[PDB]
Ligand binder design. Structure first.
Ligand SMILES: N=C(N)Nc1ccc(CC(=O)c2ccccc2)cc1
Length: 247
Protein backbone atom coordinates (compact mmCIF):
# COMPACT_ATOMS: atom_id res chain seq x y z
CA UNK A 1 0.00 0.00 0.00
CA UNK A 2 1.40 3.39 -1.10
CA UNK A 3 0.63 6.11 1.43
CA UNK A 4 -2.24 5.39 3.80
CA UNK A 5 -1.81 4.32 7.43
CA UNK A 6 -0.55 1.37 9.44
CA UNK A 7 -3.39 -0.54 11.08
CA UNK A 8 -4.15 -3.54 13.29
CA UNK A 9 -6.06 -6.72 12.51
CA UNK A 10 -8.81 -5.65 14.94
CA UNK A 11 -9.79 -2.99 12.39
CA UNK A 12 -9.70 -5.46 9.44
CA UNK A 13 -10.84 -8.77 11.09
CA UNK A 14 -11.65 -10.46 7.78
CA UNK A 15 -8.12 -10.11 6.35
CA UNK A 16 -6.29 -13.38 5.65
CA UNK A 17 -2.50 -13.61 5.20
CA UNK A 18 -1.34 -16.35 2.80
CA UNK A 19 2.19 -17.81 2.79
CA UNK A 20 3.93 -20.54 0.80
CA UNK A 21 6.23 -23.19 2.28
CA UNK A 22 9.63 -23.72 0.66
CA UNK A 23 12.04 -26.66 0.67
CA UNK A 24 14.09 -26.31 3.85
CA UNK A 25 11.82 -24.36 6.17
CA UNK A 26 11.46 -20.83 4.80
CA UNK A 27 7.93 -19.41 4.62
CA UNK A 28 7.39 -16.39 2.36
CA UNK A 29 4.32 -14.14 2.02
CA UNK A 30 2.38 -14.71 -1.18
CA UNK A 31 -0.90 -12.80 -1.08
CA UNK A 32 -3.77 -11.36 0.88
CA UNK A 33 -7.32 -12.71 1.04
CA UNK A 34 -10.67 -12.31 2.81
CA UNK A 35 -12.69 -14.64 5.06
CA UNK A 36 -16.19 -14.89 3.55
CA UNK A 37 -17.29 -17.82 5.75
CA UNK A 38 -15.73 -19.86 8.61
CA UNK A 39 -14.25 -22.39 6.18
CA UNK A 40 -13.66 -20.20 3.13
CA UNK A 41 -11.14 -17.56 2.09
CA UNK A 42 -11.38 -15.69 -1.20
CA UNK A 43 -8.29 -14.40 -3.02
CA UNK A 44 -6.84 -13.93 -6.53
CA UNK A 45 -5.87 -16.70 -8.96
CA UNK A 46 -2.68 -15.01 -10.17
CA UNK A 47 -1.30 -15.76 -6.70
CA UNK A 48 -1.37 -19.54 -7.14
CA UNK A 49 -1.37 -20.24 -10.89
CA UNK A 50 2.37 -21.02 -11.00
CA UNK A 51 2.26 -23.28 -7.91
CA UNK A 52 -1.19 -24.95 -7.62
CA UNK A 53 -0.14 -27.41 -4.89
CA UNK A 54 -2.42 -26.85 -1.87
CA UNK A 55 -0.02 -28.55 0.55
CA UNK A 56 2.58 -25.78 0.13
CA UNK A 57 0.33 -23.06 1.52
CA UNK A 58 -0.42 -21.73 4.98
CA UNK A 59 -3.21 -19.33 5.88
CA UNK A 60 -3.22 -17.07 8.92
CA UNK A 61 -6.21 -15.25 10.37
CA UNK A 62 -6.02 -12.67 13.18
CA UNK A 63 -2.48 -11.71 12.17
CA UNK A 64 -1.25 -8.07 12.16
CA UNK A 65 2.44 -8.51 11.34
CA UNK A 66 4.29 -10.05 8.42
CA UNK A 67 6.98 -12.02 10.24
CA UNK A 68 5.90 -12.20 13.89
CA UNK A 69 3.04 -13.82 15.82
CA UNK A 70 -0.09 -12.00 17.00
CA UNK A 71 -2.07 -12.83 20.14
CA UNK A 72 -5.22 -14.60 19.00
CA UNK A 73 -3.99 -15.56 15.53
CA UNK A 74 -4.97 -18.87 13.96
CA UNK A 75 -3.01 -21.02 11.51
CA UNK A 76 -4.72 -23.12 8.82
CA UNK A 77 -3.89 -25.62 6.09
CA UNK A 78 -5.57 -25.54 2.68
CA UNK A 79 -8.04 -28.40 2.17
CA UNK A 80 -8.97 -27.36 -1.36
CA UNK A 81 -7.47 -24.72 -3.66
CA UNK A 82 -9.93 -23.65 -6.33
CA UNK A 83 -8.66 -21.51 -9.22
CA UNK A 84 -10.84 -19.98 -11.92
CA UNK A 85 -10.67 -22.08 -15.09
CA UNK A 86 -10.91 -19.06 -17.42
CA UNK A 87 -8.15 -17.07 -15.77
CA UNK A 88 -5.76 -15.40 -18.22
CA UNK A 89 -3.26 -12.54 -18.25
CA UNK A 90 -2.52 -10.13 -21.10
CA UNK A 91 0.10 -7.40 -21.18
CA UNK A 92 -1.32 -5.67 -18.10
CA UNK A 93 -4.79 -7.05 -17.45
CA UNK A 94 -5.63 -10.23 -15.56
CA UNK A 95 -9.04 -11.73 -16.32
CA UNK A 96 -11.21 -13.82 -13.96
CA UNK A 97 -8.62 -13.22 -11.26
CA UNK A 98 -10.43 -14.86 -8.38
CA UNK A 99 -9.80 -17.93 -6.21
CA UNK A 100 -11.23 -19.86 -3.27
CA UNK A 101 -9.35 -21.64 -0.48
CA UNK A 102 -11.11 -24.04 1.86
CA UNK A 103 -9.23 -23.91 5.16
CA UNK A 104 -8.90 -26.30 8.09
CA UNK A 105 -6.85 -26.33 11.29
CA UNK A 106 -4.72 -29.36 12.19
CA UNK A 107 -7.63 -30.55 14.33
CA UNK A 108 -9.77 -30.33 11.21
CA UNK A 109 -11.75 -27.25 12.25
CA UNK A 110 -12.66 -24.01 10.48
CA UNK A 111 -12.27 -20.49 11.88
CA UNK A 112 -13.81 -19.52 15.21
CA UNK A 113 -14.96 -15.86 15.13
CA UNK A 114 -13.43 -13.47 17.66
CA UNK A 115 -12.49 -9.81 18.01
CA UNK A 116 -9.66 -10.37 15.52
CA UNK A 117 -11.32 -12.91 13.22
CA UNK A 118 -14.61 -12.07 11.47
CA UNK A 119 -16.25 -12.76 8.11
CA UNK A 120 -16.99 -10.08 5.53
CA UNK A 121 -20.29 -9.95 3.62
CA UNK A 122 -20.58 -10.69 -0.10
CA UNK A 123 -22.49 -8.27 -2.39
CA UNK A 124 -25.87 -8.93 -4.02
CA UNK A 125 -26.26 -9.80 -7.71
CA UNK A 126 -24.96 -6.83 -9.70
CA UNK A 127 -25.23 -4.53 -6.70
CA UNK A 128 -22.18 -2.28 -6.61
CA UNK A 129 -21.72 1.09 -4.91
CA UNK A 130 -22.26 4.19 -7.04
CA UNK A 131 -19.07 5.45 -8.66
CA UNK A 132 -17.43 8.13 -6.54
CA UNK A 133 -17.97 6.02 -3.42
CA UNK A 134 -15.07 5.83 -0.97
CA UNK A 135 -13.81 2.34 -0.12
CA UNK A 136 -10.81 0.90 1.71
CA UNK A 137 -8.08 -1.59 0.81
CA UNK A 138 -5.71 -3.46 3.12
CA UNK A 139 -2.42 -5.26 2.60
CA UNK A 140 1.24 -6.03 3.34
CA UNK A 141 2.26 -4.75 -0.10
CA UNK A 142 5.09 -2.36 -1.01
CA UNK A 143 5.03 1.19 0.38
CA UNK A 144 7.11 2.53 -2.53
CA UNK A 145 7.79 1.23 -6.05
CA UNK A 146 11.53 1.29 -5.33
CA UNK A 147 11.21 -0.91 -2.21
CA UNK A 148 12.29 -4.57 -2.44
CA UNK A 149 10.95 -5.57 0.99
CA UNK A 150 7.40 -5.44 2.39
CA UNK A 151 6.31 -3.53 5.52
CA UNK A 152 6.19 -5.55 8.75
CA UNK A 153 2.87 -4.04 9.83
CA UNK A 154 -0.45 -4.28 7.99
CA UNK A 155 -1.53 -1.08 6.18
CA UNK A 156 -4.74 0.38 4.78
CA UNK A 157 -5.90 3.39 2.80
CA UNK A 158 -9.04 4.83 1.22
CA UNK A 159 -9.63 5.17 -2.51
CA UNK A 160 -12.61 6.16 -4.64
CA UNK A 161 -14.41 4.07 -7.26
CA UNK A 162 -14.00 5.32 -10.84
CA UNK A 163 -16.58 4.71 -13.59
CA UNK A 164 -15.93 2.34 -16.47
CA UNK A 165 -16.28 5.24 -18.91
CA UNK A 166 -13.44 7.13 -17.24
CA UNK A 167 -11.20 4.10 -16.75
CA UNK A 168 -11.68 3.16 -20.41
CA UNK A 169 -10.33 6.52 -21.59
CA UNK A 170 -7.20 6.32 -23.82
CA UNK A 171 -4.85 7.88 -21.24
CA UNK A 172 -6.11 5.40 -18.65
CA UNK A 173 -6.45 1.74 -19.65
CA UNK A 174 -8.48 1.97 -22.85
CA UNK A 175 -10.30 -1.24 -23.78
CA UNK A 176 -8.13 -3.37 -21.47
CA UNK A 177 -10.54 -2.91 -18.55
CA UNK A 178 -13.83 -4.80 -18.76
CA UNK A 179 -17.17 -4.72 -16.93
CA UNK A 180 -15.94 -7.66 -14.83
CA UNK A 181 -13.41 -5.26 -13.28
CA UNK A 182 -13.54 -2.14 -11.13
CA UNK A 183 -11.13 0.80 -11.06
CA UNK A 184 -10.43 2.75 -7.89
CA UNK A 185 -7.91 5.46 -7.09
CA UNK A 186 -7.11 8.57 -5.09
CA UNK A 187 -8.29 11.79 -6.77
CA UNK A 188 -4.80 13.17 -6.02
CA UNK A 189 -3.04 9.97 -7.13
CA UNK A 190 -1.18 9.86 -3.81
CA UNK A 191 -2.35 6.53 -2.36
CA UNK A 192 -2.88 3.17 -4.08
CA UNK A 193 -2.36 -0.60 -3.91
CA UNK A 194 1.01 -1.98 -5.06
CA UNK A 195 3.00 -5.21 -5.54
CA UNK A 196 2.27 -7.64 -2.72
CA UNK A 197 -1.26 -6.36 -2.13
CA UNK A 198 -2.85 -8.79 -4.61
CA UNK A 199 -5.70 -10.95 -3.37
CA UNK A 200 -6.58 -8.38 -0.74
CA UNK A 201 -10.06 -6.87 -0.21
CA UNK A 202 -11.54 -3.66 -1.56
CA UNK A 203 -14.21 -3.01 1.08
CA UNK A 204 -17.10 -0.59 0.64
CA UNK A 205 -19.92 0.44 2.94
CA UNK A 206 -23.05 -0.49 0.99
CA UNK A 207 -26.24 0.48 2.82
CA UNK A 208 -24.56 0.70 6.22
CA UNK A 209 -22.99 -2.73 5.68
CA UNK A 210 -19.31 -3.52 5.08
CA UNK A 211 -19.19 -5.42 1.79
CA UNK A 212 -16.38 -7.16 -0.13
CA UNK A 213 -16.68 -5.30 -3.44
CA UNK A 214 -13.37 -6.08 -5.09
CA UNK A 215 -10.16 -8.10 -4.97
CA UNK A 216 -6.77 -6.48 -5.66
CA UNK A 217 -5.85 -7.71 -9.15
CA UNK A 218 -3.68 -5.44 -11.32
CA UNK A 219 -2.49 -1.98 -12.29
CA UNK A 220 0.24 -0.10 -14.14
CA UNK A 221 2.94 0.90 -11.66
CA UNK A 222 1.80 2.24 -8.27
CA UNK A 223 0.14 5.59 -7.52
CA UNK A 224 0.81 6.95 -11.01
CA UNK A 225 -1.46 9.64 -12.42
CA UNK A 226 -4.27 8.29 -14.64
CA UNK A 227 -3.35 4.70 -13.80
CA UNK A 228 -5.86 3.39 -11.21
CA UNK A 229 -5.64 0.10 -9.39
CA UNK A 230 -7.92 -2.51 -10.98
CA UNK A 231 -10.02 -4.95 -8.97
CA UNK A 232 -11.96 -8.12 -9.69
CA UNK A 233 -15.67 -7.17 -9.58
CA UNK A 234 -16.95 -9.64 -6.96
CA UNK A 235 -20.64 -8.98 -7.70
CA UNK A 236 -20.15 -10.52 -11.15
CA UNK A 237 -18.85 -13.84 -9.81
CA UNK A 238 -21.53 -14.77 -7.27
CA UNK A 239 -22.65 -17.74 -9.41
CA UNK A 240 -19.11 -19.13 -9.62
CA UNK A 241 -18.60 -18.58 -5.87
CA UNK A 242 -21.82 -20.31 -4.82
CA UNK A 243 -21.37 -23.37 -7.03
CA UNK A 244 -17.83 -24.01 -5.76
CA UNK A 245 -18.41 -23.44 -2.04
CA UNK A 246 -21.39 -25.79 -1.79
CA UNK A 247 -20.06 -29.35 -1.75
N1 LIG B 1 -1.63 0.90 -9.56
C1 LIG B 1 -1.84 -0.19 -8.94
N2 LIG B 1 -2.73 -0.20 -8.02
N3 LIG B 1 -1.12 -1.21 -9.32
C2 LIG B 1 -1.13 -2.50 -8.86
C3 LIG B 1 -2.37 -3.18 -8.59
C4 LIG B 1 -2.38 -4.52 -8.13
C5 LIG B 1 -1.16 -5.23 -7.93
C6 LIG B 1 -1.24 -6.69 -7.42
C7 LIG B 1 0.07 -7.47 -7.52
O1 LIG B 1 0.82 -7.44 -6.55
C8 LIG B 1 0.46 -8.28 -8.75
C9 LIG B 1 -0.38 -8.36 -9.91
C10 LIG B 1 0.01 -9.12 -11.05
C11 LIG B 1 1.25 -9.81 -11.05
C12 LIG B 1 2.10 -9.75 -9.90
C13 LIG B 1 1.71 -8.99 -8.76
C14 LIG B 1 0.08 -4.55 -8.19
C15 LIG B 1 0.09 -3.20 -8.66
Amino acid sequence: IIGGEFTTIENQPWFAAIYRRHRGGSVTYVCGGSLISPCWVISATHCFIDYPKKEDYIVYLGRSRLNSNTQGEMKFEVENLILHKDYSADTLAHHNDIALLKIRSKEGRCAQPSRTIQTISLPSMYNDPQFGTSCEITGFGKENSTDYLYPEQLKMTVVKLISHRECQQPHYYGSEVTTKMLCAADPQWKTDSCQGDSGGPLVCSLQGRMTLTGIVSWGRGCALKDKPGVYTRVSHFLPWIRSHTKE
